[PDB]
């Protein structure tokens, strides 16, 4: 759709220049690509992430036009996120996929992503290494030798990320 | 029989900001990171590999527009270029 399509000619040119170092692509007719979007807009003790609805709509359409079946999940707790991940890692569609896209969107801190029931005194965060852990060769062999792209839209703390310089 | 395989490989994270730092969001425009990732995706998915596209995204956040933000690519184990060959 809105994605600028790759022409057969240029595709083979790309395919020619460095074939040996490209992740193989699975035929369009048989592959079942999966993608998972976890978005948290509603929180019990943190300001609502107003605008998420637009991000969701945005990513979903994109992934779909890229050839991915998009499973959307809203307002989960770390536990629920950890569960949904184990589920996604076990999906049968991966056996016939060539890559996968995981997308997280929610508040966050430096150590991890914030789940719906998170508070200052009682944590509810998903440690980043856990996502990498649940989708590796041991916990998800269906994706061995296949691209696993994680995209995260979350704060990494409170600092505004800037310093001043003179001029 | 059996063979050994790498426990971790072919991964690539892409965060909206750098550690310790926040990311921006607008009520009727959504996250800048997102809207921008999409914009670039729609544009260069046909000719650039994912890593390159991610870089191009970081590059658009280079000049601090008040709502400063710097997207980070992390834990990359992609041993090859990943072109999305949209259109097939």
């Amino acid at each position: 759709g809105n994605v600028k399509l790759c022409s057969l000619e240029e595709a083979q040119r790309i395919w020619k220049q460095k074939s040996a170092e490209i992740y193989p692509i699975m035929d369009k007719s048989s592959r079942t690509r999966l993608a998972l979007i976890i978005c948290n807009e509603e929180f019990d003790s943190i300001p609502r992430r107003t605008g998420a609805e637009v991000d969701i709509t945005g990513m979903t359409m994109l992934l779909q036009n890229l050839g991915y079946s998009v499973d959307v999940k809203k307002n989960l707790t770390a536990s629920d996120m950890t569960t949904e991940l184990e589920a996604f890692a076990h999906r049968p569609e991966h056996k016939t996929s060539d890559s996968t896209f995981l997308v997280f969107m929610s508040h966050g801190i430096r150590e991890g992503i914030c789940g719906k029931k998170h508070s200052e005194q009682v944590p509810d965060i998903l440690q980043l290494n856990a996502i990498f852990n649940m989708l590796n060769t041991k916990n998800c062999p269906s994706l061995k030798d296949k691209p696993k792209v994680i995209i995260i839209q979350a704060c990494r703390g409170d600092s505004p990320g800037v310093v001043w310089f003179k001029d | 029989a059996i063979k050994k395989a790498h426990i971790e490989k072919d991964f690539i994270a892409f965060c909206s900001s750098t550690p310790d730092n926040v990311s921006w969001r607008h009520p009727t425009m959504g996250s800048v990171f997102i809207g921008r990732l999409i914009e670039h995706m729609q544009e260069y998915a046909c000719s650039c590999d994912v890593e390159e596209i991610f870089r191009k995204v970081r590059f658009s956040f280079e000049q601090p527009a008040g709502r400063a933000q710097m997207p980070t690519t992390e834990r990359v184990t992609l041993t090859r270029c990943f072109y999305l060959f949209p259109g097939h």
């Binding site: 508040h107 979350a154 | 926040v22 921006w24 969001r25 009520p27 996250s31 709502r67």
Partner: peptide
């Protein structure tokens, strides 16, 4: 604009 807000903080994510």
């Amino acid at each position: 604009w807000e903080h994510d």
